[PDB]
């Protein structure tokens, strides 16, 4: 359904580029901004660069009528040193479970990440802002 959804705002607050790869949603559908009926191909988000001081918005939600929620993953990688993984991501807003999940995994010493806006208790996961800084 459209009740389970997540909007992640990758905001590059640093002065060096970052890239997004392996962005795959197991369930649900990637859709346009504010519109959950206009599905957008994942390729429109796979492998693009986020320039410094810019925001990239990814919107995912479950399919209407359907009852599966939406879960997915994507990797932030550094394009300056061979797409080395910056931090892996995993989000889960399920249809029939109470707690949502939002986990960052992996690590490299050259990047700092601070995220907020998620709700893990009930309902939709929420809009998540993820500030990234190559420091």
């Amino acid at each position: 359904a459209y009740a389970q959804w997540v909007i992640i705002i990758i905001h590059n607050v640093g002065s060096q580029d970052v890239k997004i790869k392996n962005l795959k949603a197991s369930w649900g559908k990637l859709h346009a901004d504010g519109d959950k009926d206009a599905e957008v191909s994942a390729s429109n988000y796979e492998g693009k660069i986020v320039k410094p001081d810019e925001k990239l918005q990814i919107n995912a939600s479950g399919r209407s009528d359907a009852a599966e929620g939406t879960t997915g993953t994507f990797d932030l990688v550094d394009p300056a040193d061979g797409d080395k993984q910056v931090r892996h991501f995993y989000w889960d807003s399920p249809w029939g479970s109470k707690t949502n999940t939002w986990t960052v995994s992996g690590s490299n010493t050259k990047w700092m990440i601070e995220y907020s806006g998620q709700n893990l208790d009930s309902g939709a996961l929420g809009t998540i802002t993820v500030d990234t800084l190559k420091k």
Binding site: H11, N12, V13, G14, S15, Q16, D53, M112, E114, D131, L133, K135
Partner: protein, 374 residues
């Protein structure tokens, strides 16, 4: 009832008043204190007016304030800039010290000698003072504290207000209760020496240089300019500006010493989630936000410097941009205390978190010396 007229007409009482109030000595700046050196020659008479309008005022807003003020008059000293026949004569010792300081080989030696001379003789001189007594009390309870202060009158009767009030007409206890005019000691010197001393006291040497537009930043509403080329060794720059014509480089004039707060401070990279500089010294400030990534180990960030708080005054913002993301402030001076119109740039919303406090200041014109030839 004796007044200031009766004490000023008597050499003994007049000299007692002068000595007990340090009227011949300057002020050194825990706080302002008088110097032990006599700055001016002892005058043969004092200009004074009589004021005996006493007041007792109490307010109990749990705060309670009380103030018993018993004035006696005002004593005026005459400065060279007035042009009147009587002028306070500087001590020959102070003039000799100034001449010796100005005679040293190099500018650094002259500045050090002047610093020592003004640390010993004080920075300013009180030219209008009010004589009399004042007894104040402050009480605050909620836990509790009481504070009595006596300045003038029989200080041994601070605990008994009636007796202290009765003792306010004794001339031997009159003290300076207020200062309504202060003149810089440097301003008491002759003009050719006054100019040299004032120029040498300026902490910073200034230099105008050409500017270059920072690459990128096309999203911003205005162009950002920085000093062009490598800055001369030993010099520093203050920050990014929108001025497309020229930029200011500054250089300290005094070496480092114990107890001497440097005019400029180095900046270090922020702890986390921010690329903006932070001042090494606690209270200091800088003018502009660094557009880009700040690195204090390589130029041009290695030589960007902050300013001592006394060097700057709050300015005013003029905003450019259509949204929060593009909003930027050009800082302008607020219309003797004029400040440079550097058109410093300060971004409104820095993308990161935990950023430094937003710059809001402009640099004084009276702290920078140009064309020294140094």
């Amino acid at each position: 009832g004796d007044t200031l007229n009766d004490v000023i007409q008597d050499p003994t009482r007049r000299n007692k008043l002068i000595n007990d109030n340090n009227l011949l000595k300057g002020i050194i700046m825990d706080g302002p204190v008088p110097s032990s050196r006599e700055l001016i020659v002892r005058p043969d008479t004092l200009r004074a007016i009589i004021n005996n309008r006493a007041t007792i005022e109490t307010t109990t807003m749990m705060y309670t304030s009380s103030r018993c003020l018993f004035p006696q008059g005002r004593i005026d000293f005459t400065t060279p800039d007035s042009g009147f026949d009587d002028v306070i004569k500087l001590s020959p010792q102070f003039t000799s010290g100034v001449q010796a300081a100005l005679a040293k080989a190099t500018g650094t030696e002259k500045r050090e000698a002047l610093q020592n001379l003004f640390q010993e003789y004080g920075c300013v001189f009180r030219t209008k003072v009010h004589i009399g007594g004042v007894l104040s009390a402050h009480t605050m309870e909620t836990k509790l504290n009481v504070k009595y202060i006596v300045n003038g009158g029989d200080y041994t009767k601070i605990q008994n207000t009636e007796e202290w009030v009765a003792s306010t007409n004794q001339s031997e206890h009159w003290r300076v209760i207020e200062v309504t005019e202060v003149t810089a000691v440097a301003d008491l010197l002759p003009q050719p020496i006054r100019g040299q001393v004032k120029d040498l006291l300026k902490p910073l040497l200034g230099k105008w240089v050409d500017v270059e537009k920072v690459p990128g930043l096309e999203s911003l509403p205005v162009s950002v300019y920085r000093p062009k080329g490598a800055i001369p060794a030993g010099w520093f720059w203050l920050g990014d500006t929108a001025d497309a014509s020229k930029a200011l480089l500054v250089k300290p004039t005094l070496p480092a010493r114990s107890g001497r707060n440097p005019a400029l401070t180095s900046l270090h990279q922020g702890s986390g989630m921010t690329e903006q500089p932070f001042v090494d010294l606690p209270q200091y400030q800088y003018l502009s936000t660094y557009f880009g990534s700040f690195a204090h180990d390589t130029p041009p960030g290695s030589t960007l410097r902050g300013l001592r708080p006394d060097h700057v005054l709050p300015g005013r913002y003029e905003m450019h941009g259509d949204t929060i993301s593009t909003a930027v402030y050009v800082t302008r001076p607020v219309d003797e205390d004029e400040c440079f119109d550097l058109k410093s740039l300060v971004r409104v919303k820095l993308p990161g978190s935990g950023n430094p406090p937003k710059p809001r200041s402009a640099l004084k014109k009276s702290m920078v010396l140009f064309d020294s030839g140094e």
